Design brief:
The structure is a homodimer of 192-residue chains. With 192 residues, the first copy, chain A, is mainly α. Chain A has 8 helices and 3 strands. Chain A has one domain. In chain A, a hairpin with a 5-residue loop joins strand 1 and strand 2. In chain A, helix 1 packs antiparallel against helix 3. Bound molecules: fe (iii) ion (FE) (2 copies). Chains A, B: Homodimer.
Amino acid sequence: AFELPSLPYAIDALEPHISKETLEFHHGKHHNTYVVKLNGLIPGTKFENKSLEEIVRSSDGGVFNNAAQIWNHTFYWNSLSPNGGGAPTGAVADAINAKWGSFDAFKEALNDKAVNNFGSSWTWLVKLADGSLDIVNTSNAATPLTDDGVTPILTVDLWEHAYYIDYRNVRPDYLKGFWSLVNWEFANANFA
Amino acid sequence: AFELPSLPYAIDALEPHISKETLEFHHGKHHNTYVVKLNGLIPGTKFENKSLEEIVRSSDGGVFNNAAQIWNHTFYWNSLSPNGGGAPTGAVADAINAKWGSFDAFKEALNDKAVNNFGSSWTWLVKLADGSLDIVNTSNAATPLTDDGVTPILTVDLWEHAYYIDYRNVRPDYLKGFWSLVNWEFANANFA
Ligand SMILES: [Fe+3]
Ligand SMILES: [Fe+3]
């Protein structure tokens, strides 16, 4: 059975960008729920023995929605850090410059993609087959994990539960918080 | 151009099932935003002259998402009432009994569809071409308004902004609030 991964940092470590309360419901209830629902769904199917990633890459319907959300949220918690934020560094900063000319142009581009990602969704920084970076949006539980040759490097959860407590309807403010928390080390770890 | 309709009741009339705060955000910011967005999208286009319903039934993309959302929310405010709730009445009470055998089976069928309506969504009580009632789920801005011969009779908004402030992650509690508020007069007007 799958388990709810621990949060990589204290429940208040993301303040004042993401609240202790948001983390309590988002990790504690939302993430958790996906884990208990999947655990309940797999027994008696050709999924009980397989990897979380294996399932996400070979299911649909309910099993997919749950397995993919578990994966996406775990990747999301890692995309933030009490020590992230600020300028990108290393290999990712460079690929960012190679593709968008500048960090600022990339940030504007991602913000644009995320603010207009309609409904429950995720906005991703990914690495394509050519080694170049790109930004892609997915709806609901969809994830670049199921794209052969497309490597996820960072994600931002845009479901309303991710920011409603702290920011209500204002996604731009939430995005300002994400940029104060973005984990460039996890990004570079994934890019390399 | 389009305007935000007035709520059919006082900002605190749905208390304690849906809060004054939820109404201020849901009606005052979200509903309003779709209206500003549409008005900002139709000028000098093949939709500037059309009515809301004509636009929703002849667009896609951004224009569809905003027009439909304005329509769906308006229909949602009408599906609630400080004088609604309790047992269904009149023609709809009888049409529910005809399809599901009883009000209780209908309520459990709708609750099941609504709690499992994945991501941002809407659950509708609709009247079909054959005249029989049914429950259908739509995602994001999709609405039965675009299905010929299908008549929307009531809707429950399941986007998380509809209940997060009041119930956080617990859709079942929000659903309990909806049943205390359901507008059977609105439903009977749509049915007849
Ligand atoms: Fe989430
Ligand atoms: Fe809504």
